């Protein structure tokens, strides 16, 4: 496939960075007291 | 001619060895309840939190978490030892609010002078249809 | 905080009041039944929703109804 | 005091009068089978001797006889 | 004199709420006071709560 | 032949199946004596198997490609090709017996419903009355048709309890 | 609480009647050496802000991407390595 | 003729723009 | 004797006896008329 390096960067981004960021943001938002 | 009796902090507590089913951290930041009764003799009774305590001869005070625990203990005292008690609600700031025997007369007995709160003058099937109160944060029972 | 309602079909038997475990109902004077008393729910904030009052009502249909709504620290029966 | 053989003579009569009256052991099963729940309740409390009587002596006697019946079945 | 049917008269229930809707029952007694439901009707069919008697208004029952 | 089915009499698979079953039974029989109990039991089983296969082939049953009998459940199709005893006649027989039991139960329930204590009559059945009603239930088709044409077999919709919609 | 006897309730001392005790806490400002304490408080100077401390965590996120694009290949991960031959399949397929 | 790397990069950029439009629609829906 | 006959008339006793009689009749029908696949009259 063209640009074999792309999956090695996108898979961890969508499975590790994006989920951690999304969970942290959701946790901080669902307990804001004043949204 | 009835006035809520004040809560005396000098009332001794029943003889109990301690248990893990007592007050937690909610009573420190939210509220707790206190039940005070008068016993004619020192006798063993069952606590709502588990175990057995001994109520002293005279005034007894017991602090519990929920109001249901106090009411259960009062029911046990009324149906087993024929003892009448008073329940109060205490807040962390230090405010005491009288509860259960609100007007000195038990709720099962009519007192003539209470508030007829939440008493519809219709039948259960005479409520408004759910489609007639759509887009309104109310149920058919509140009309 | 549940919604407790009393209807005119009540006969003033006072069974629902005796069956309440949190002291939410009480009997007040009335003139629509032979008992000359009706049930009321002045302390609905302490109602937990056990529906014990409905299991004790002898009228058909029930004269006392409990509609579970917004849950609070008291309605959920939480001691912690 | 003093262990001995204490027994009561002829406490229950032997007849089929109660065999034709299902639910005789329970007080709550006296209004008759108004609903099908009564049939299930008849079997769910047949061996609950604690509910059929408040006397410990009768409960013990029932347990002893039930044990004898079980032994006969095993035999 | 007296309102409603006499005691011991077969009546038919008209309240859809009632477990005995469209069913017949015997009039046990009728209260002679300004009561919303003064007609006491007994039934031979127990409801889900095990009750066989109920109170109905004068317009909630039909003779025979 | 109805739907590409071959009669079991001329079906080769049917004969092969019978031969294989008898062969297995004889193989099991070979490990015993000639007059012992297991030998007699196996011989009886062989005789029953042969009689069953012969009866199925003689009754005119239809066999498929697998060699097993097939039933025709269609009036007219089974009546014109001689297969009314497959589902038609059994349907009539069932309907009759089922209606007999149902009518007997209905009559018993209606007869005891007029008693001062019907629930006890339901848990403690009246043997003589039940026997008489069971006998009377054999004429259930005539009685049911008469009650239907009479209007007493049904209850008025206005007299039956219903939910509040 | 004024638990001098059998009284475990006191409105004037309601703080002690709800079990609000530290149990194990102890205030003491004489422990960590001044020279070592200064070094650590100095190392974690501006890292006490939510935005700045999150930045340190953001570095971990960059390391995750760095591992996939470089770290995984340097540890000779099987997924980033090569492949040997193949199979045909059940029937005449690929 | 397999797709080249530049094509994948262009597709990813267009997807980024589409995601921006999607987040804008989501924000509008939240209001 | 009346009580015994009343007990024998109860729902469980009558149910078991009826089921036993029906099962016995069916077993004997299949014993004397076995492998009745169709209604051959
Ligand atoms: C909904 C469609 C869809 C799905 C299910 C997938 C699934 C997948 N993609 Mg892919 N992708 C898509 C659309 C999609 N893609 C489109 C339209 C493009 C063109 C830009 C790409 C370009 C792309 C590349 C370059 C790569 C993948 C890769 C992958 C694999 C790993 C995921 C990853 O980390 O890459 C990240 C994916 C992206 C950065 C772009 C995807 C954006 C889509 C459209 C978001 C859709 C969200 C959805 C509609 C909303 C659902 C809610 C949900 C988020 C909770 C995975 C199996 C990787 C791979 O090949 O693994 C070996 C890889 O490197 N995709
Ligand atoms: C020496 C052993 C023993 C004894 C003497 C008792 C005695 C008693 N038990 Mg108990 N129990 C036992 C063991 C025992 N139990 C065991 C091992 C268990 C774990 C399963 C239980 C769990 C248990 C519960 C949960 C309860 C009791 C209750 C009771 C009391 C009422 C029983 C009754 O009349 O119900 C009626 C008896 C029956 C309806 C018999 C039905 C038999 C079962 C349902 C059928 C099983 C099928 C069988 C294996 C064959 C299958 C073939 C089938 C296809 C035909 C009674 C004093 C009840 C009580 O209220 O206590 C006061 C109660 O609710 N028991
Ligand atoms: C239960 C549904 C059902 C179905 C799907 C069929 C289907 C069929 N029937 Mg049939 N039939 C039925 C019920 C049914 N029947 C009942 C209840 C009776 C008793 C009155 C009959 C009595 C009957 C006879 C006497 C015959 C059929 C015949 C047929 C076959 C051709 C007739 C046809 O359909 O032409 C079209 C139908 C129109 C109404 C037009 C066909 C496969 C015929 C046959 O055997 O085929 C040669 C034949 O003569 N049926
Ligand atoms: C007098 C007995 C009797 C009669 C006349 C009927 C009649 C009827 N039943 Mg019913 N039923 C019965 C007993 C009876 N049932 C019993 C005892 C049960 C509990 C298992 C049921 C459970 C039942 C269900 C769940 C349903 C029906 C339904 C129906 C209707 C459709 C026919 C059917 O599907 O039957 C089906 C029959 C059964 C499922 C079981 C039958 C039970 C036994 C075999 C028959 C009774 C034997 C009786 C005790 C013999 C006494 C003899 C007497 C001399 C003492 C029909 C009007 C259906 C309906 O509503 O249709 C619209 C339906 O859904 N029945
Ligand atoms: C088995 C563990 C291991 C080993 C032996 C190496 C070995 C090597 N790495 Mg490496 N690395 C690793 C894990 C490892 N890495 C991990 C887990 C990550 C993710 C944080 C990285 C991210 C990384 C980067 C970004 C770079 C290297 C580079 C290098 C090479 C130059 C040395 C260097 O500056 O390192 C550091 C070297 C052969 C450098 C290079 O240019 O490779 C030739 C380079 O730029 N590594
Ligand atoms: C309840 C239904 C029923 C019916 C209608 C019959 C009917 C019959 N039995 Mg039978 N039997 C039954 C139940 C029944 N039996 C049961 C439950 C048993 C087990 C104890 C037996 C054991 C039995 C034996 C041992 C014999 C019969 C025999 C017979 C036949 C001689 C008359 C007859 C047709 C006799 C027979 O086979 O006829 C030659 C005979 O030898 N029966
Ligand atoms: C609705 C389901 C159903 C149906 C329609 C049948 C139908 C049939 N079965 Mg079968 N069976 C079934 C379920 C069913 N079975 C189940 C669930 C089992 C597992 C227990 C069996 C196990 C079984 C065995 C082991 C055998 C059969 C046999 C038979 C046939 C014998 C007919 C007969 O008894 O002669 C005629 C009977 C009468 C004329 C009596 C009618 C009058 C009665 C007494 C009325 C009853 C009123 C209540 C018949 C075609 C036998 C056979 O030979 O197969 C071909 C046989 O050996 N069945
Ligand atoms: C090995 C280590 C691995 C490291 C991995 C990486 C670690 C990084 C950690 C960083 C944590 C996240 C940042 C801080 C969290 C935060 O502020 O919460 C953000 C706010 C906080 O709530 C509240 O929202 C308030 C707004 S109001 O109250 O609603 O007005 C406001 O006060 C403020 O935002 C906030 O307090 O929460 C939200 O509203 C977020 C909800 C939705 C979260 C997912 C967004 C969708 C995906 C992102 C878009 C993708 C790209 C789109 C274009 C293509
Ligand atoms: C992808 C996005 C990546 C984002 C990266 C963010 C990095 C953090 C950052 O910028 O912080 C910005 C803050 C701002 O502080 C500020 O520093 C200011 C001084 S100056 O501006 O830094 O000069 C100061 O005036 C102010 O008080 C203070 O708040 O700067 C710091 O204090 C970072 C110093 C980090 C020192 C600790 C490093 C880890 C030590 C590990 C020990 C063991 C390791 C072996
Ligand atoms: C520039 C550039 C670079 C950066 C490239 C980058 C950064 C690429 C990023 C690409 C990304 C990240 C694409 C993400 C796309 C996400 C999409 C298409 C999501 C769509 C979601 C949809 C359509 C549905 C949303 C929904 C809606 C609307 C709701 O209302 C409910 C929620 C939900 C159901 C999800 C680098 C530096 C590399 C090199 C130099 C040039
Ligand atoms: S639901 Fe329970 S707590 Fe509420 S009024 Fe009825 S009995 Fe009382
Ligand atoms: S239980 Fe029913 S009838 Fe009795 S007092 Fe309460 S609401 Fe009235």
Q: Could you characterize the architecture of this molecule?
A:
Chain C: It is an enzyme of class 1 (oxidoreductase). Chain C: Its main location: plastid. This is part of a larger assembly, with 9 protein chains of 9 kinds. Chain C has helices at 15-19, 52-56; strands spanning 3-6, 26-29, 37-40, 64-67. Chain C has 80 residues and is of the alpha+beta class. Chain C has one domain (1-80). Chain G contains 2 helices and no strands. The longest helix of chain H has 26 residues, at 5-30. Chain H has 31 residues and is mainly α. With 41 residues, chain I is mostly helical. Helices cover 71% and strands 0% of the residues of chain I. Chain I is built from 2 helices and no strands. The N and C termini of chain I lie far apart (47 Å). Chains in contact: A-G, A-H, B-C, B-E, B-G, C-E, D-F, D-I, E-F, F-I. The B-C interface holds B 24-26, 30, 65-69, 71-72, 99-100, 102, 107-112, 114-125, 139, 141-142 and C 3-9, 14, 17-18, 20-23, 25-30, 37-42, 44, 46, 48, 61-63, 65, 67, 69, 73-74, 77-80. One ligand SQD sits between chains A (17, 20-22, 24-26, 28-29, 32, 35) and G (54, 57-58, 60-61, 64).
Question: Short description, anyone?
Answer:
It is classed as photosynthesis. This is part of a larger assembly, with nine protein chains of nine kinds. By secondary structure, chain A is an all-alpha fold.
Order of helices and strands of chain E: EEEEE
The fraction of residues in strands of chain E falls at 25-35%
Q: Helices and strands of chain I: which structural class? A: mainly alpha
Distance between the termini of chain E: 21 Å
> Total number of helical segments of chain E?
0
Q: Helix coverage percent of residues of chain E?
A: under 10%
Main β-sheet description of chain I:
none
Residues in β-strands, percent of chain I: under 5%
Helix and strand element order of chain I = HH
| Multimer state | part of a larger assembly
Shape of chain E: globular
Ligand species: chlorophyll A, ligand SQD, beta,beta-caroten-4-one, iron/sulfur cluster
Most extensive chain-chain interface: B-C, 35 and 41 residues
Secondary structure tally: strands of chain I: 0
Please work out how many helical segments of chain I DSSP would assign: 2
Question: What spatial order of strands do you see in the largest sheet of chain E?
Answer: 4-3-2-1-5
CA gyration radius of chain I, whole angstroms: 16 Å
Question: Main beta sheet of chain E, described?
Answer: 5 strands, antiparallel
Family (chain G): Belongs to the psaH family.
Keywords (chain G): Chloroplast, Membrane, Photosynthesis, Photosystem I, Plastid, Thylakoid, Transmembrane, Transmembrane helix
Organism (chain G): Chlorella sorokiniana
GO biological process, one term (chain G): photosynthesis
């Amino acid at each position: 496939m063209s640009a074999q390096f792309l999956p090695s960067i996108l898979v961890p981004l969508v499975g590790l960075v994006f989920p951690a960021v999304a969970m942290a943001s959701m946790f901080l938002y669902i307990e804001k007291e004043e949204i | 001619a009835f006035t809520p009796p004040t809560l005396q902090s000098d009332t001794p507590s029943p003889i109990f060895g301690g248990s893990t089913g007592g007050l937690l951290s909610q009573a420190q930041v939210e509220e707790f309840h206190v039940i005070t009764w008068e016993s004619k003799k020192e006798q063993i009774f069952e606590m709502p939190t588990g175990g057995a305590a001994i109520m002293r001869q005279g005034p007894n005070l017991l602090k519990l978490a929920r109001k249901e625990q106090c009411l259960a203990l009062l029911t046990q005292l009324r149906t087993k030892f024929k003892i009448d008690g008073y329940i109060y609600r205490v807040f962390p700031n230090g405010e005491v609010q009288y509860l259960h025997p609100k007007d000195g007369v038990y709720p099962e007995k009519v007192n003539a002078g209470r508030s007829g709160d939440n008493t519809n003058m219709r039948r259960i099937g005479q409520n408004k249809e759910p489609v007639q109160i759509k887009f309104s944060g109310k149920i058919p029972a509140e009309f | 905080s549940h919604t407790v309602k009393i209807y005119d079909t009540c006969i003033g038997c006072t069974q629902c009041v005796r069956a309440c475990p949190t002291d939410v109902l009480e009997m007040v004077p009335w003139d629509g039944c032979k008992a000359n008393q009706i049930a009321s729910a002045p302390r609905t904030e302490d109602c937990v929703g056990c529906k014990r009052c409905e299991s004790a009502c002898p009228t058909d249909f029930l004269s006392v109804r409990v509609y579970l709504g917004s849950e609070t620290t008291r309605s959920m029966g939480l001691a912690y | 005091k003093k262990v001995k053989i204490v027994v009561d003579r002829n406490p229950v009569a032997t007849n089929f009068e109660k065999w034709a009256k299902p639910g005789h052991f329970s007080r709550t099963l006296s209004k008759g089978p108004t609903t099908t729940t009564w049939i299930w309740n008849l079997h769910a409390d047949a061996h609950d001797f604690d509910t059929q009587t408040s006397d410990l002596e009768e409960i013990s006697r029932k347990v002893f006889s039930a044990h004898f019946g079980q032994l006969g079945i095993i035999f | 004199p007296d309102v409603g049917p006499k005691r011991g008269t077969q009546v038919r229930i008209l309240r859809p709420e009632s477990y005995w809707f469209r069913e017949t029952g015997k009039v046990v007694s009728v209260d002679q006071s300004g009561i919303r439901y003064p007609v006491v009707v007994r039934f031979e069919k127990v409801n889900y709560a095990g009750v066989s008697t109920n109170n109905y208004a004068l317009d909630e029952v039909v003779a025979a | 032949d109805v739907a590409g089915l071959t009669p079991c009499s001329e079906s080769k698979a049917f004969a092969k199946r019978k031969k294989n079953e008898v062969k297995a039974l004889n193989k099991r029989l070979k490990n015993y004596e000639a007059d012992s109990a297991p030998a007699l039991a196996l011989k009886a089983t062989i005789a029953r198997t042969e009689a069953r296969f012969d009866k199925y082939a003689k009754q005119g049953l239809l066999c498929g490609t697998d060699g097993l009998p097939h039933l025709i459940a269609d009036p007219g199709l089974a009546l014109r090709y001689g297969h009314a005893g497959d589902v038609f006649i059994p349907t009539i027989g069932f309907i009759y017996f089922a209606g007999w039991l149902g009518y007997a139960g209905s009559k018993y329930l209606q007869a005891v419903a007029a008693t001062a204590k019907p629930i006890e009559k339901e848990i403690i059945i009246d043997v003589p009355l039940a026997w008489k009603l069971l006998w009377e239930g054999f004429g259930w088709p005539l009685r049911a048709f008469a009650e239907y044409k009479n209007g007493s077999l049904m209850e008025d919709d206005a007299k039956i309890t219903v939910s509040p919609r | 609480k004024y638990g001098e006897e059998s009284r475990y309730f006191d409105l004037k001392d309601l703080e002690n009647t709800v079990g609000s005790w530290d149990m194990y806490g102890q205030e003491d400002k004489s422990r960590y050496n001044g020279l070592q304490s200064e070094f650590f408080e100095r190392a974690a100077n501006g890292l006490s802000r939510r935005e700045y401390i999150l930045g340190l965590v953001a570095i971990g996120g960059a390391g995750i991407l760095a591992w996939g694009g470089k770290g995984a290949a340097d540890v000779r991960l099987p997924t980033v390595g090569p492949q040997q031959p193949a199979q045909v399949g059940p029937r005449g397929r690929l | 003729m397999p797709i080249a790397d530049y094509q994948v990069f262009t597709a990813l950029f267009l997807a980024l723009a589409t995601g921006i439009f999607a987040v804008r629609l989501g924000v509008a829906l939240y209001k | 004797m009346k009580d015994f006959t009343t007990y024998l008339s109860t729902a469980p006793v009558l149910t078991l006896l009826s089921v036993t009689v029906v099962a016995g009749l069916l077993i004997e029908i299949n014993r004397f008329f076995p492998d009745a696949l169709i209604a051959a009259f």
